[PDB]
């Protein structure tokens, strides 16, 4: 009925005596600069717009009603809100707003601003928002009390509204949410944009009189006076800039960099620290999306064949120092991954749709193709050939052509110019040995963003962000009605997916019913070969210039850079 803390599943870790998180130093000193890289470019400051390339960190301009801890999958703690009263089914909540809550101009954050914000997303926001919150109302029932009512139960959908940025009506009444912003909006978080150069840098300054600096969720965080993002057109130029000291911190995503290029005077003299930690929670995964709305990838057999042409064991051994693990799940390294045979609860979910399922969903555990790693896997390439031929794509000369029409089998791989892409030519070569032509097109960050959003590609790389439980967000990425959300990478509209996700969205907060539902969905998504699995590693590889100190404990779901601070003694030992 009344609480200070919420959890999507289970109970919140910091439900009692909450003074600060475990993964901060509450005494961390304020001051100093951290300089970071970003790849590509940006052209505006509105993260929530229908178009444009928003600046680094422009999704954290605003405080929210509650904020999530970084050492838990989905637990919410007071930020702008102090507390909430609620129905046992979470279908309604009355949120008490902290009377100290202020925007950067020193004006109050009120229940009206929250009501205004919800209506703003509903009428000018991304089209998925009004679809998800279609039966929902958000009303200021008192100056500092906002009442949220859902039309149907959705504990996660309710808690997700706690993460909505709270906009100041006084500013946003004059700007459409759907339009990009050439200058930063009036905001409220612990850092404000203070200068920038369009497409090149953004500087954030710590708000020194931030109203919430001493809330428990904020203690020991937001330590740096300045956070600077410099933009680099590709990762090789950024990595060389890092080694020369042009920015302070690097997340290393290239296996060859890590294995062979962390060398030179700066490492010998220990000006740069390098660190590698096993990461035991849910994992981001890389994939290549097949646009299944294009005729070239409409047939599951052709998608299966092209997958067989991707020689991961060769790439890992010859190119990547054995660093990577093969992606094999949409719930990678969680309990929701379909890594065993369906149990009885899964078959109750699955058997009704047997006619619309690959039969392997019932008989086999999904395993991406394995080669011996020698190059030229003959079993896998012969199977690819067999499947292509069945789908009507047959060799005429050295080229695969449609058996009916004589059209060559050809597609374009769309790539960001900014990425390393060492796997691309070997994949192209493998495809060429099957008679498949893959054109490579590298484009800038603004073209890539636009085309990724509109699905104007045959194939492109996509990251599937870690999903620690089967979230109601899955509908946005996979359900037919959300096809134009920008998150449905293959273009799939399936009644099987829809039905399993409708079940999931009706079981929000219920781990017992979500376990077999997540596994079931995982079998459907994987066995349809909607995307070509690439790789991940359960290990964070970080390097930084030795000017920082860190809390003893690192959070489970993030690197915790926002808990670091500038260490004047370590920094004094580095050259200019």
């Amino acid at each position: 009925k009344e609480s200070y803390a919420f959890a999507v599943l289970g109970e919140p870790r910091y439900a009692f005596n909450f003074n600060h998180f475990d993964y901060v130093n509450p005494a961390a000193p304020k001051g100093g600069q951290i300089t970071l890289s970003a790849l590509g470019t940006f052209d505006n400051f509105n993260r929530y717009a229908l178009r444009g390339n928003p600046g680094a960190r422009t999704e954290q301009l605003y405080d929210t009603l509650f904020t999530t801890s970084d050492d838990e999958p989905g637990s919410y703690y007071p930020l702008i809100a102090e507390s909430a009263r609620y129905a046992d089914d979470y279908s309604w909540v009355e949120v008490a707003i902290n009377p100290r809550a202020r925007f950067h101009d020193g004006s109050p954050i009120t229940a009206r601003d929250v009501e205004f914000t919800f209506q703003k997303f509903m009428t000018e926001g991304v089209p998925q928002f009004r679809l998800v919150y279609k039966g929902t109302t958000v009303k200021a029932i008192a100056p500092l009390t906002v009442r949220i009512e859902l039309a149907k139960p959705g504990k996660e959908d309710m808690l997700s509204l706690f993460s909505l940025p709270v906009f100041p009506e006084k500013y946003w009444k004059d700007h459409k949410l759907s339009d990009p912003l050439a200058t930063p909006p009036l905001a409220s978080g612990p850092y404000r944009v203070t200068s920038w150069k369009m497409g090149q840098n953004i500087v954030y300054s710590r708000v020194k009189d931030y109203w919430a600096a001493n809330l428990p969720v904020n203690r020991g965080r937001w330590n740096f006076d300045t956070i600077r993002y410099d933009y680099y057109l590709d990762d090789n130029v950024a990595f060389e800039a890092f080694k020369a000291g042009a920015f302070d911190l690097r997340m290393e995503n290239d296996a060859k960099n890590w294995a062979t290029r962390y060398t030179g005077k700066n490492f010998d003299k220990k000006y740069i620290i390098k660190d590698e930690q096993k990461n035991e929670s849910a994992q981001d995964t890389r994939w290549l999306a097949f646009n299944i709305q294009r005729p070239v990838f409409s047939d599951r057999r052709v998608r299966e064949a092209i997958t067989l042409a991707f020689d991961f064991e060769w790439m890992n051994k010859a190119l990547f120092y054995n660093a990577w693990s093969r992606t094999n799940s949409y719930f990678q390294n969680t309990e929701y991954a379909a890594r065993n045979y369906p149990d009885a609860a899964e078959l109750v979910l699955l058997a009704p749709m047997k006619k619309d399922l690959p039969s392997e969903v019932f008989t086999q555990i999904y395993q991406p193709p394995v080669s011996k790693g020698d190059g030229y896997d003959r079993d896998n390439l012969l199977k690819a050939d067999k499947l292509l031929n069945e789908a009507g794509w047959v060799l005429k000369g050295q080229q695969r052509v449609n058996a009916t029409t004589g059209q060559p089998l050809s597609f374009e791989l769309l790539l960001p110019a900014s990425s390393n892409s060492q796997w691309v030519l070997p994949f192209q070569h493998s495809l060429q040995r099957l008679g498949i032509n893959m054109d490579i097109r590298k484009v800038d960050n603004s073209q890539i963003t636009n085309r990724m959003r509109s699905r104007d590609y045959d194939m492109m790389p996509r990251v599937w962000r870690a999903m620690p439980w089967p979230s109601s967000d899955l509908q946005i990425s996979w359900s037919s009605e959300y096809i134009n959300s920008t998150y449905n990478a293959p273009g799939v509209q399936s009644p099987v997916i829809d039905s399993l996700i409708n079940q999931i969205i009706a079981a929000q907060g219920n781990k017992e019913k979500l376990l077999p539902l997540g596994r079931a969905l995982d079998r459907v998504l994987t066995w349809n070969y909607y995307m070509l699995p690439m790789w991940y590693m359960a290990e964070d590889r970080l390097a930084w210039w030795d000017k920082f100190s860190q809390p003893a404990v690192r959070p489970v779901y993030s690197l915790g850079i926002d808990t670091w601070w500038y260490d004047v003694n370590k920094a004094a030992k580095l050259p200019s």
Binding site: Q128, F129, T449, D473, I476
Partner: peptide, 7 residues
């Protein structure tokens, strides 16, 4: 993501 478009 319910509030913004991909990246």
């Amino acid at each position: 993501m319910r509030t913004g478009n991909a990246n």
